[PDB]
């Protein structure tokens, strides 16, 4: 219900790549989807621009904390995905790029 613009519950890894790389999206475009690798957790997919490869999509595991919370690196955890998204929109803080706009469809 009423997903955030960045939340694509059931979108696969490959369809996330497909849509992020399509027209209307650009560097920093991103989404969060259920993980296809770790049942019960989420994956972050973000478009980046590499000197060598050109446009690419990179994926990060979002780890769950027992009894609530999320992280990408243990160095910093969050009580929710809103806080995680805000943090990595404000600073890359180790990611390949800052989160910019949710995937446009």
């Amino acid at each position: 219900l009423e997903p955030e613009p960045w939340f694509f519950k059931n979108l696969s890894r490959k369809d996330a790549e497909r849509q992020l790389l399509a027209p209307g999206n650009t560097h920093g475009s991103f989404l969060i989807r259920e993980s296809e690798s770790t049942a019960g957790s989420f994956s972050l997919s973000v478009r980046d621009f590499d000197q060598n490869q050109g446009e690419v999509v990179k994926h990060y595991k979002i780890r769950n904390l027992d009894n609530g919370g999320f992280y990408i690196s243990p160095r910093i955890t969050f009580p929710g995905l809103h806080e995680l998204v805000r943090h990595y929109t404000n600073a890359s803080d180790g990611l390949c790029t800052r989160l910019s706009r949710p995937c446009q469809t």
Binding site: S37, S43, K58, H59, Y60, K61, I72, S73, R75, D93, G94, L95, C96
Partner: peptide, 4 residues
């Protein structure tokens, strides 16, 4: 997957 990428890592930080």
């Amino acid at each position: 997957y990428e890592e930080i």
